[PDB]
Design a protein around this ligand. Structure first.
Ligand SMILES: O=c1ccn([C@@H]2O[C@H](COP(=O)(O)OP(=O)(O)O[C@H]3O[C@H](CO)[C@@H](O)[C@H](O)[C@H]3O)[C@@H](O)[C@H]2O)c(=O)[nH]1
Ligand SMILES: O=c1ccn([C@@H]2O[C@H](COP(=O)(O)OP(=O)(O)O[C@H]3O[C@H](CO)[C@@H](O)[C@H](O)[C@H]3O)[C@@H](O)[C@H]2O)c(=O)[nH]1
Ligand SMILES: O=c1ccn([C@@H]2O[C@H](COP(=O)(O)OP(=O)(O)O[C@H]3O[C@H](CO)[C@@H](O)[C@H](O)[C@H]3O)[C@@H](O)[C@H]2O)c(=O)[nH]1
Ligand SMILES: O=c1ccn([C@@H]2O[C@H](COP(=O)(O)OP(=O)(O)O[C@H]3O[C@H](CO)[C@@H](O)[C@H](O)[C@H]3O)[C@@H](O)[C@H]2O)c(=O)[nH]1
Ligand SMILES: [Mg+2]
Ligand SMILES: [Mg+2]
Ligand SMILES: [Mg+2]
Ligand SMILES: [Mg+2]
Lengths: 308, 308, 308, 308
């Protein structure tokens, strides 16, 4: 009997990953076979310029469980992962790196946690360890800032390695976004979520790129950087009128030219800052409208059918 | 004979509402039964972290009229209400609070008013009463400002407790919005509307949250905060040229350095304010386009079929 | 034999138009009957607060050719006209005012011009005449500005009275816009268009509203108000460096404090203006993208079928 | 046997092209016949005001392979090309100019390169030659700037003359854009692409229009002009506090009025520039979201079906 349904999906983005495919697939077949469930391996060749696609073709010819999504260009690891998740049909979707930095044997624990009733199972590293002190401090500050300014609780030490149930995968597909912060998106779609500790196996930064990623994470879920300027401009304006009133009082109790210039410069700056703050409020509203996030995400229903 | 049609829908958002469900449902069954019409109770469990969903399951197992929409996360009372209204199928939809702050026996008067021919029946409190003087003054000022700057007439003392006919519910579903001011939206979709006075039963503010809600209400229906800055910048620029011309006249009838600095600062500030005003005009246009409100909402038709 | 096709559609928006419906329909029946073609009258009751809808019901009960679209609220004359055009099914659509300011007997000339092969037939007044000199000057300046800054040639002295063929009506329905300048939209959708002169029959301004309408017309079809500021800021910056270099030359061939303040203020203003200009460019691009105008509008095809 | 499938499509935009249609079609029939494949000629009459459409009708009546798309207005060469590509159904689409500036006999080499396995075959001029030195320098600088600021590698000396496979045509149709930079779009959709050298046959600038085209190309694929201003404002602010601290140190080791004015002006300018930079970041995000580019473009698939 052919089940014709897939219980587990493994999404693996590739970029120049020859001489690693054999080890990858050997370890995965060693791990995914004792689970005794139907599975599929979605290898997303993300615009590699070397002999990576051909070995994927050779593997897929021999093995039915391997499926290949060949992106036209190099779109980036996150976009390749999103494409693989879009083309995955299993009940649970588990991203995996080609170099096998994250252990595959944690798939057993991920599946057990999922079967316990969780919809998201994060695979969080126990300790950063090999990361440099500068990287650790920057990551900690970034996560604290994300927690403070946003209403979203992104778990620490989380990578792409995780398990998403079919509900979460459908909800993520329900988010049309081009500037996506995947960590914040997964934490935004809040189902019953849990984490499993794992110690990265041994022997495993363009800070401009990390800064850009952090900027995307800040901007996609917080509008406060667009709201502060109204209050700052109002404060500066109020200080300007206070200074002008004090100068008038001094004149009656003449104003030097530099004092009048102070007053006018501060007032104009405050008015312009108020204008920028109002425009920033409207621009944040436009962003929230344009991102086209669903108003709500229903998890379970009693007595009703899921809306089209 | 099974009617297979629902005449009244009650949408109730929940958040940590145990030990209140029994009283809620007892009072509702006491009120909704003498109406002698088919009804349904849409309980929208809005991401409660305590034993609220389980009691809803127990109630729904015993009672067919109770339907549960379990949101994945805590999306907020307004979003839970919107989800319940989306999942309601009755001719009239009546939001209800779990704590029963608003009397359920007003549902009879709401239904009578609806049967009199109205499409929206507001349930307005006769007098704020227990509200503090600061809250009363802030609410009054907010409503006067809303009336002045917008073309929309939001009735005073209105909460979520109200009746929406199927026409109004469909029209509200026809408004794709993520930054929604529900009061302003309901007043924007203008059908035959009326109000019923009720005195809240006895024993029934994070001013930052109220300020944010007021800001959303101001920004979603008025663009004047984006239009003022053009006029302000033009006025400031005109004052700058007036001052410069007066200084030139004084020179011919030398200009001190502070006077030239005044002229240049004022002119640059006015030009920048004009630029900000033009950008604000275009941004307000972008907001109105992006909010994707329908051009018109047809209420009744003679001799024609409703367009797809 | 029932044709089951409508050859001409008359769209008439109404707002407090009692005691004029009888004269309206008498004149229309006097005009539309000698044409010997099937027609329909779409009366769009635009949220009138008096006894206008009831007389429309009485007329529609007696006459099959009268169809009523009753808007829920007062959306404005332009929006009511758009709704009536959306609900019209004739080959040619002719807007008409309720007070009969524009003669109905011009419908004969409009139909003749349409049958000559034109897709848009404007009904332009021969001379403004009764309009005040201020109104004439403002209208002329507005039309000259529209012609200069836009690539669109809006014919002068054009009102809502006109004929749109089914091709033009479909193309206009293909323009999803909430901030619509109907004159500019009709001139933007450029088919074979012509005009017919007519002298308004005898006995037939909130300048803030006219200013807002003009602002919408300017902003919906021109982006130059968002492009100028880059050039202005660059010019101001270049002047600032020129002044600073001249001051340095004077020092070597000390700079007074006011001169350094001039230099810094001008440079900062120019840099901020360049930033505003770049943001305005991107905002104009966002507007053009968001307005969702079709890339092209195909008029006639040979050897191919019209794309879905 | 009728193939009922088209192997090659030629898209030719027209604008006042009489007395050239006969030579055009003679040369094309001379070139496209030895290919021994089914073809079609899509002539997109782009709002010509002279006797161009009628000759196209006469040609299409005699020849079945000629198909005419008559645009309502003059939308521009790029938009007419896009419309023709939208209405083309061949496996390969080859844009062609009416004046035959680009040789038609290069279609043979384009087809050979396509049959070799490439999805895009650029037709690049070997040397600009007749172009003026100013034009050559401006084009070279523009292409270097495009390469530097964008991640996209637009090949040099490329015009509209090229071959797009059906995959690339479908991907381009998958890009809903109103402000389109076709060169950057084709380079953005990155398939297996190649180029063929050709020396333009003998006897074959409104710099404002070239500047606008360059501005569109810069703005549609780069957001850095919206990102720089945050860093510039932060630098200016830091300089302002440095100057203020140095002045305080000088006072303790009084500040002249011009020094305090320097400090305040620089600080306000830096704060406003930071606000403009944040707004520019959010506006670039809004642009990337609104342009509605697909997240990824899948080229080939193994073991899976193409998603709807
Ligand atoms: O453009 C692409 C397309 C696909 N992948 C795939 O993504 C997987 C893992 O990528 P990798 O770069 O090895 O991530 P990590 O091993 O977790 O470590 C990274 O840690 C930093 C940020 O996580 C990166 O800047 C470093 O390049 C990299 O060492 C692999 O299967 C790759 O093939 C990329 O990395 N980049
Ligand atoms: O995140 C959520 C999800 C659902 N609900 C439901 O909303 C209903 C009523 O909410 P409630 O907070 O009790 O509103 P009120 O009783 O009308 O009074 C409110 O008045 C203020 C603004 O109306 C709020 O800030 C106060 O928290 C609250 O006392 C209840 O069924 C709740 O379960 C919430 O309130 N918050
Ligand atoms: O909100 C609405 C809804 C519908 N209509 C209909 O529009 C038609 C004609 O409107 P009308 O105001 O009479 O336009 P005009 O007769 O052409 O003259 C106008 O000229 C100015 C701008 O055209 C307006 O400001 C003046 O109110 C008005 O006299 C009539 O059938 C009205 O019923 C409105 O005018 N306003
Ligand atoms: O509005 C339109 C509609 C269609 N076409 C068609 O486009 C084709 C080629 O256009 P053309 O202007 O001749 O381009 P080139 O021959 O490559 O040279 C151009 O080089 C510059 C930019 O490429 C232009 O500014 C010059 O007008 C023009 O000489 C022809 O079939 C035209 O009919 C236009 O050019 N403009
Ligand atoms: Mg790695
Ligand atoms: Mg309460
Ligand atoms: Mg009138
Ligand atoms: Mg040419």
């Amino acid at each position: 009997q052919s089940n014709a349904t897939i219980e587990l999906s493994i999404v693996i983005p590739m970029y120049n990953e020859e001489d690693n495919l054999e080890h990858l697939f050997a370890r995965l077949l060693e791990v995914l076979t004792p689970l005794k469930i139907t599975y599929e391996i979605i290898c997303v060749n993300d615009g590699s310029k070397d002999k990576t696609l051909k070995q994927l073709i050779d593997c897929y010819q021999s093995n039915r469980q391997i499926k290949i999504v060949n992106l036209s260009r190099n779109f980036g690891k996150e976009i390749a992962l999103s494409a693989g998740i879009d083309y995955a049909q299993g009940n649970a979707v588990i991203p995996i790196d080609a170099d096998l930095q994250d252990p595959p044997e944690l798939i057993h624990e991920l599946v057990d946690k999922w079967r316990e009733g969780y919809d998201i199972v994060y695979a969080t590293r126990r300790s950063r360890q090999g990361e440099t002190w500068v990287k650790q401090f920057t990551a900690k500050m970034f996560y604290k800032v994300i927690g403070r300014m946003t209403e979203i609780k992104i778990p620490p030490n989380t990578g792409d390695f995780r398990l998403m149930d079919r509900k979460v995968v459908n909800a993520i597909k329900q988010l049309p976004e081009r500037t996506r912060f995947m960590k914040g998106l997964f934490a935004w779609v809040g189902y019953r979520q849990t984490f499993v500790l794992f110690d990265r196996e041994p022997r495993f930064w363009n800070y401009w790129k990390l800064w850009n990623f952090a900027l995307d994470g800040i901007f996609s879920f917080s509008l406060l950087p667009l709201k502060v300027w109204t209050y700052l401009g109002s404060i500066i304006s109020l200080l300007s009128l206070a200074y002008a009133s004090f100068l008038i009082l001094k004149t009656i109790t003449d104003v030097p030219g530099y004092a009048s210039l102070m007053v006018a410069i501060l007032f104009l700056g405050g008015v312009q800052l108020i204008s920028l703050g109002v425009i920033g409020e409207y621009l944040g509203r436009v962003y929230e409208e344009v991102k086209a996030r669903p108003l709500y995400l229903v998890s379970d229903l009693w007595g009703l059918e899921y809306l089209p």
